[PDB]
């Protein structure tokens, strides 16, 4: 979590987002509304399932090996076989622990990156028509923020016909 979004300026998550992983939520004149962002959610699912295809399955076939349980005491060969098996088990346990920790850290960093990417994409779409309040929300200044000129935050925000900086963006009380 290095981008500081999921535990940063977003104070808490949203229980009830049952369709997507990242989304938009608003309260304009036409009432409250929520939508999910398919692109960032799909990218996160794509990378996590790439990890899942790397890990789940792909098991090497080991048919004949050495004896790993001994019912008697022999000496040199018994000690060597036990040492080899213990070395292999310790090395693979370290590999498993390091892989799990590194991939969990990368998953959390990827989630933080996707949240910050969606936030910055919305900020660059809005330009000077909105101010970031630091809660992850965007105070949008013109009219009809996400009902009729705000379903177009799929990539088609005009941000020119609603250059309303005189209302409250640059105004004196």
């Amino acid at each position: 979590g290095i981008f500081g979004a999921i535990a940063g300026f977003i104070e808490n998550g949203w229980e009830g987002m049952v369709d997507g992983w990242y989304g938009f939520r608003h309260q304009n004149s036409e009432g409250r509304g929520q939508a999910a962002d398919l692109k960032s959610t799909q990218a996160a699912i794509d990378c996590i399932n790439g990890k899942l295809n790397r890990l789940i399955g792909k098991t090497n076939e080991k048919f004949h090996q050495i004896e790993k349980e001994f019912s008697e005491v022999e000496g040199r060969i018994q000690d060597l076989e036990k040492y080899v098996e213990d070395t292999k088990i310790d090395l693979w346990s370290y590999n498993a622990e390091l892989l799990v920790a590194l991939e969990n850290q990368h998953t959390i960093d990827l989630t933080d990156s996707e949240m910050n990417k969606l936030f910055e994409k919305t900020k660059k779409q809005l330009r000077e028509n909105a101010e970031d309040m630091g809660n992850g929300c965007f105070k949008i200044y013109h009219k009809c923020d996400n009902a009729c000129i705000g379903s177009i935050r799929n990539g088609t925000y005009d941000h020119d016909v609603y250059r309303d900086e005189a209302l409250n963006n640059r105004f004196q009380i």
Partner: antibody
Amino acid sequence: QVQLQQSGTDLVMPGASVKLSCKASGYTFISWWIHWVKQRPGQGLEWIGEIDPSDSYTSYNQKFKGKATLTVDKSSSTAYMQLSSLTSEDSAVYYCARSGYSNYPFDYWGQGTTLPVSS
Amino acid sequence: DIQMTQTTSSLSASLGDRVTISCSASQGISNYLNWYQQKPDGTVKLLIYYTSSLHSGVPSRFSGSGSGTDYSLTISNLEPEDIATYYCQQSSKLPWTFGGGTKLEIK
């Protein structure tokens, strides 16, 4: 599991006021919205209004505007819906539903409270 | 207000038949039609949240499809436990409006 406990049957005189209840259990009451649907025996389902338990956000249907008022109790995890000036047309089964947000589908429904408005 | 229409108010279908329930909208609701199942005792349950997305606990027999103004709900393996009234609801423009319903019957 998620349950929405509702009253069974309330006998209310016509022209009076009733305050239905819908106890919520098995989930966090604040983070999920509560709706209200009225179903007549001779009509279909009719959405009345919605409430946000976090800050008591109200937005009702245009037909049921002065008829219903939606309130919540975060301490007891119960959502109320007060009916005013009950007539013969208000005698129907009322359902409370948990959706997730305003425009999200109703996940779990209550048992339904039959309200016979008769003398 | 957008009017939800369901012409097949009463439909008759026997066991093992693929019954299709269609709900038509006045205008495009943009993939925002929900499906509800009201059992005759009075219990209402959500089956397909939006279109082609099954709710949790819903069996694989129920399925949904459609886009624009025409949406359909398919029950490929209809059983006695699947005999109930079926409703359609939008989630586009306040107010949220439900359909007339569709009650399944044994022929």
